Every structure is written in structure tokens, then in C-alpha cells.
A and B are shown apart, each in its own frame.
Chain A
Amino acid sequence: DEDETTALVCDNGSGLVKAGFAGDDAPRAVFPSIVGRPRHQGVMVGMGQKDSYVGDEAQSKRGILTLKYPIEHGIITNWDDMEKIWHHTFYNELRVAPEEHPTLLTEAPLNPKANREKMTQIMFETFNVPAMYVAIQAVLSLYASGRTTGIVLDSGDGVTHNVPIYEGYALPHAIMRLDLAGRDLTDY
């Protein structure tokens, strides 16, 4: 539904997925990083009912669903559910088919390599995106905040990476990764 072949941006956290197009100041829509599945035996015939629900569908029908998060502490392990979320996100609600738009994804610098590799593989092989770029949260946070220099303490849902940047340069020896995030605060 867009009138320009801008890049797409999709911030796939362990909590929620914020997505929209590049050049804007906000995601156009926010979806949970969830694929839901029924935990009950169907009783009635001709009720429709999906084998799995995606994003906002998973929360909307959650009364009888178990809701799973494909991403654990920032890393995707269930790529199949990620593909479902992305297809819904890009084609049904954001109305941007990746085939016609380059796509940028986000991740902690110490997020294990499989995350950036699998996300890149899926956008190129199941979505046919013309181009890809996996960006680092510390970089992204300083740009959003109007800084080139500072400490990015991302107290997000998954893992906190705590990464210092000076004059645009990484200072990797000073990174303190902490296994504490919003999901644990909720559990407490």
C-alpha cells in the first residue's frame, strides 16, 4: 500500500515485534512475538479454528491457546514461527511485501550468531527480499536518541547487552552482557 520502495524495518524482540517502513518515526503496527496454539479438544463441527494463530490473532483468541514466543532471551530458535509472524506482519497488516522492499532487522552484538544468520536466510529465501541488513541495538539506540557517543543500556524483554560507543566506535572490551530482562521481572 506504500507508494515508494523504501526499506522495511522490523524490530523482533523476545516480547513484541515493532514494524513499519524505513524513514518513518514510528512502527506502523506492533505485533507480539507470538504464535498461539489451542490446548483444548474441539467439540463443535464447522467452527473454523486454526491450528495456530499469529501475532495479534494469538492474543485475540488466547482464552484457549497456549502462547509461545519463538525468540528466547533475544535469539530466534523457532524460525517457522518467525516466518509466520513476518508473513502476517508484512503482508496482512503493514501491507508491505518484502519482495519489493529491502529489510532491516535488529539484535544485541553478542546475540549468538545463529540469530543474525537465520534471520538473513529467511528473509532472502522465504520472502525473496531484494536486500538485507541486521543492525545492532546499541547503534540503533544512539541514532534514535540523537547521539554518537554514550552507553546503551537496553532494559528490554530478553537480554541486556550494555554497550558503550564513542564517536561512532564500538568499545567491545567494555561490554557487560547481563542475563536479566523484562521477562524475568514479570516472572518475579
Chain B
Amino acid sequence: MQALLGARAKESLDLRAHLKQVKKEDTEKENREVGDWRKNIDALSGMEGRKKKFES
């Protein structure tokens, strides 16, 4: 009498687990573009004088 509710609840879980496993495998396999970068600055602390350009 319960054989089908077991089987039906399982079919739903197996499909949901499949679909989530597919997106999770890519989420976990590669993760660099999903991260961040230093984005550093210039400051010009070595600028002890004027440049060679006529504009400086």
C-alpha cells in the first residue's frame, strides 16, 4: 500500500538532486571569475621632479 508513495517521493528527490548536482558541480569545479582582483594604485611616490615632456 505504501510502495508508490515511497517511489514517488524518491523520484522527486532524484530529479531535484540531479538538477542541483549539475549546477553545483560547475559551481565547485571552477571558481576564479566568481572571485575578485587587487585593483591596485599608482601614487607616484618616486616623482621627485618634472618629466622630460614639454608639458611638464
Contact = CB atoms under 8 A, between A and B. Distances in A.
Contacts of A143: 54-55
Interface in B26-54: 54
B56 A23 contact: no
A25 to B, nearest CB: 8
Interface residues of A, number: 5
A25 B51 CA distance: 13
A179 B40 CA distance: 47
B55 A23 contact: no
Nearest to A22: B54
A42 interface: no
A41 to B, nearest CB: 51
Contacts of A23: 54
A146 interface: yes
Interface string A133-145: 0000000000110
A73 B55 CA distance: 28
A146 B56 contact: yes
A134 B6 CA distance: 91
A19 to B, nearest CB: 17
A143 B56 CA distance: 9
Interface string A21-39: 0010100000000000000
7 contacts: A23-B54, A25-B54, A143-B54, A143-B55, A144-B55, A146-B55, A146-B56
Interface of A: 23, 25, 143-144, 146
For the complex of A and B, the 3 pairs showing the least CB-CB separation, nearest first, are: A146-B55, A143-B55, A146-B56
